[PDB]
Amino acid sequence: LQYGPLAYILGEKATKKMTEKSKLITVDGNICSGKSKLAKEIAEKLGLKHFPEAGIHYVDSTTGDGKPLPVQFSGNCSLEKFYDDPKSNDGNSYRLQAWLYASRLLQYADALEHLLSTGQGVVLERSIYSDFVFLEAMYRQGFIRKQCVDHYNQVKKVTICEYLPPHVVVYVDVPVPEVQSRIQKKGNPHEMKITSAYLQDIENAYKGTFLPEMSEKCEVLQYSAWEAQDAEKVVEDIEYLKYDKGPWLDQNDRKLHKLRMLVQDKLEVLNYTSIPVFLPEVTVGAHQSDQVFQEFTELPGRKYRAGYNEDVGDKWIWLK
Amino acid sequence: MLKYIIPTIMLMPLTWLSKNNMIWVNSTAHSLLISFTSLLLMNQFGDNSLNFSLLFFSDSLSTPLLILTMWLLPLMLMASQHHLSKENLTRKKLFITMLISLQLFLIMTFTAMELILFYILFEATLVPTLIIITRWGNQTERLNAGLYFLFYTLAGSLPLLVALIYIQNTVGSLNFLMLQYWVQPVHNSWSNVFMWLACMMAFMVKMPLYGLHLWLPKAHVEAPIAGSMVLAAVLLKLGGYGMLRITLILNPMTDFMAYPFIMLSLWGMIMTSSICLRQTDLKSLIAYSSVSHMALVIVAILIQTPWSYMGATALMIAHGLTSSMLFCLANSNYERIHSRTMILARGLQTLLPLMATWWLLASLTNLALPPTINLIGELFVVMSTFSWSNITIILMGVNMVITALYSLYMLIMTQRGKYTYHINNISPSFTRENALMSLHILPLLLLTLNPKIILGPLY
Amino acid sequence: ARQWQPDVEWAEQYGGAVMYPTKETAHWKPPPWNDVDPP
Amino acid sequence: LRWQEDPEPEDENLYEKNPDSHGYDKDPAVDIWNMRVVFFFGFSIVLVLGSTFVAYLPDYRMQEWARREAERLVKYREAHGLPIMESNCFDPSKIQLPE
Amino acid sequence: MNPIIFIIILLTIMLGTIIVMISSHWLLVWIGFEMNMLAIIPIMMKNHNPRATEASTKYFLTQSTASMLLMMAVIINLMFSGQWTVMKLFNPMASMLMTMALAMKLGMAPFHFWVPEVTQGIPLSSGLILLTWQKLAPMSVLYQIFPSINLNLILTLSVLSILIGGWGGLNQTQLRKIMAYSSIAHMGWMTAVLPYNPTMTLLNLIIYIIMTSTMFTMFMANSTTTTLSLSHTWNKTPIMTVLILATLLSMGGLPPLSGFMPKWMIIQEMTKNNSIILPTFMAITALLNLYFYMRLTYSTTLTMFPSTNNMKMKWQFPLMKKMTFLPTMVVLSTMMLPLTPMLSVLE
Amino acid sequence: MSMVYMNIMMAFTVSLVGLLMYRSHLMSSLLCLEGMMLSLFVMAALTILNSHFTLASMMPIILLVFAACEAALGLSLLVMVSNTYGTDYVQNLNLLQC
Ligand SMILES: CCCCCCCCCCCC(=O)OC[C@H](COP(=O)(O)OCC[N+](C)(C)C)OC(=O)CCCCCCCCCCC
Ligand SMILES: Nc1nc2c(ncn2[C@H]2C[C@H](O)[C@@H](COP(=O)(O)OP(=O)(O)OP(=O)(O)O)O2)c(=O)[nH]1
């Protein structure tokens, strides 16, 4: 029975399947801040589902057979090419950021659907509320035009206003010099070209914009690089949080029903990520888009609605 | 008429249920079989028409227009195979669907015994025609062409709707056979003046009449090859067929109401022929040729003599094959050079020897070389208009001079002279291109031997 | 010659407050995308 | 650029990959069956058989009968003292003129 | 809004309309109008934003003013006849107020300024109710009082509705405003034939409801409220653009489509009554409506407008929208002309 | 009709003109709307009482109930307007021009 108005009436209220340990937690930080391990540890310690940081192919991992799709069905935006030529006139700089925000927005809807449908909390990595740090860093380094920032705000202010914020925000504070030291040791040929000014801007966005605004509606936990290695200590603080500020205290079954009806309809979530704002970075000509759409429909198990593809062994099509 | 309606509908399932690589083959083949069966409509009697049922009938006026219509559909599919080559399959099968739906409305339009059934299908042809122009035109002006082609027709069609219904409430029936026995004379009052215009201006716009023709240079020029062929070969004759029918119930008022429309036609005939002398676009030049030729049909229909009606019918069929052929010839050049400018590719007779022969044969019929049916139809209208007024010979003689000037000028600016040096992609003529022209001219030339079948009900 | 399809210049003609701009209709910002005005 | 658009493709000559191309299609097998139906149903059926069919139409529009009927009347009305043709299509005995 | 309360509110809107239809007493007719308005304002406020608040306020004031005029007509009728039966009014002044109150409720020009604005400020689902179901009750009263309506007044409202409806929609890029002005234009046809043959008022109403429901359903399926947003549908759901083309062409009155049926039948009735000028003016004036429908066809189906990069992310999800009865409505909106003599079921 | 009908019927006209000419306040206009129903109540009550139409005597009470129930809805909209702009001025309800 697909969730809807009828299921809610029959008894599928959110509060009936949510406890005091059903929280949404985001682990944020600079590049090579160790958030991956810390988030993956808080997840297993508290029995919370872990969502790997949404990338360029996150949406492709939640549909079809789960494997990444060719790059052309992602806007041709590549994280690797961003580091090589951040000033490329094609528009890969912003075209990546606009796509990544959509993936983060899509994941945040996947997260809330899991929390509101099963009662189990989730741990995220750089949720939509903290993806503007890469926006400011790109702009302050002359990687994207001013209008691109305006386009980002228009899309953000009509999408981020529908969802509730995370219960707890864990910020893994790391000084910039250490971060760049870790980049060299990691061994990524392209990521090593990240300049120090770019990484410093990301920290300023966190310290200047994200944290002060987030502290008024979330329980913010700050840990240095060394403190982040004691996963048991971090989990202890999360279990001692007061949870007295934020919009989550005003939510009831009626409101959580309306929220769930949104995050389960993934096209309604992505509706305003393609606003008719004509920006050369994200605008695509009709001839190109038409060609790519036809190719996308020829990939295995994508010509028809998921479950009606005879070419991937779906049966009983003449009765479904 | 169900024996031709049902096969035409079954072409749509054929296109959609055919193999992805056999859409053109199957549709072309079975459309030719429908055209072959249309020859049974020639069972015509000297006193009564062939009346099938309460809805449909076919007389000597509808029969030639039906055979040209069903014969034109196969030729439109051949002409479209080039520019619909990188088009995706679903849209290719939608394009063929529009062409089939247009034929279905046309044959029913030419056989509707009821004048309101005639009106509905008459207007129904606008929808597929507009879709073909605007969805499969190459230029930005196709969008503006559809608006002109749409609102010019509806500006005159809607008054016709009111007039037809008013007639039914007065006579009691719009069945054509009944009107032949219940028709009453029209008095000379201001109310009947506007009843006359409402019943006629819907067809003047489609002929088109000079002054109300600005849509044709925009629609025939921006439309794809298939759209232009049907637009100039059949859809212009929808206006002519309408007048030949509805002028039955407008006597004796047509004696004086026709004067303003004979001067627009007789003079506009000279003007549009003159325009073709200075056109810089080969497709546009052919479009203005249709206006000049259809000016004769308006005159012949409005003077109402046995010789004028015989000439008008032969002229409508004669122009249908010629105008369609000229558009096809002009498109073969476009498919190579991809430019409609007439002065861009010259001396083509040196690179395409056979295609130049088609150009000559097309031009000769356009200028009414005897004994082609182009001349037979034009000659009969000239004989009838001479008796109408001996002075008209001056206007219809001057038009002959101008018609020969712009037809051979078209044949000299493209086929003769010096070949363009910087154009090196003029490949030889495909079998598809050559066969497309042979199908236009052979029936056109063959009708000379037995022309009584295109002389209409008054033969 | 490929078929012409609308470009950004053509499209922006349909993305204003009104189709026919005049002196009065100037300064009319298009409505918000989600119909919510700032509080 | 104002957008990300594909470059304009160039028309492909069907004579490059198939010098025997009839121009109907890129597939050399389909291209040869498209030609045959056009030529067999077009020139061998509609024209040759249609032209013959129209040639032997059974007395189209009752014209040959009318000539044979007039000769009969001429024989009758000429060698009987009657006028060859009358100026009245209908006998006056059935008409009733005004006043 | 709790789902159960939403159902109860919706049923109250229908109960309000149904009471107007089944009632033989003016007070019960007035009660139905009050109940219907009481239960439609809440669904206009469901999104709780300033524009929705403004739209509801404008809607409340217009209907409230109309309701008072309607009750003033009933009392004047009572003074001059001493009865409440829902039939021809017995005083010409009552007839004018009743006719004008029903014009304000229907949004007929010049009582139309609220329809473009109220429709804009409320969601598509709310706008669908406002433009389709809300006209059943006012049209019911006109169908019963038409003998006593002033002929010049009703035709003047009908003519001005067609003109202002056609002119208003030309300068619109918001779909909800385009439908709002298309509603006003089609209203003129309904009330223009009402003096001559009330049955054709019902035929036009049913056809208008089916076609307007289809357009709103297809706009709701993609959450599109502007011309440019609707211009991406070719790159998301290509089938939907073809349906829009057929329905818009039908709404324009083009043969052989269903939308031609009411225009075709209204001309017949008026011409039988020696009314030749008005149908010709109405038919010609309706070309304005056909124009801004054809302008949506270009930007939606007949041309491929520019897309955006994120549109590719929408190809990986299906349409979960309910789209209730959309397959049936589109067919009824485009292929019902061969069944025109079925309009006699409405007699 | 009678001298009383001249004034009661004229009271409705005055309140009707008052409802169709807003000055600044949305509250001042709802009062004019309530003025119309008061004049209708008195005009309907007089006609019913004078003619001894017994069963119609309940009609003015139904009118009062529904009209008052409509005012309660009108006041709820005025309050929500005030919560947005801090005042009940109608000139602030002009966002739907565009
Ligand atoms: C007879 C003439 C034709 C009538 C047209 C047919 C009816 C309209 C279409 C169905 C509407 C519908 O069901 O409403 C929408 C939803 C449908 O459930 P869902 O979760 O969206 O889908 C679930 C099914 N699936 C996913 C399998 C497809 O139902 C409800 O909310 C049910 C509400 C029931 C309680 C109502 C409250 C009490 C009312 C009484 C108060 C006094
Ligand atoms: N332009 C852009 N790049 C991003 C964004 N989030 C991550 N990236 C890039 C930065 C890195 O090159 C890469 C992964 O960076 P991480 O933050 O995840 O750190 P790292 O993987 O090196 O180790 P860690 O998980 O922190 O322990 O992806 C983003 O929101 N915008």
Ligand SMILES: [Mg+2]
């Ligand atoms: Mg990482």
Ligand SMILES: [Zn+2]
């Ligand atoms: Zn080409």
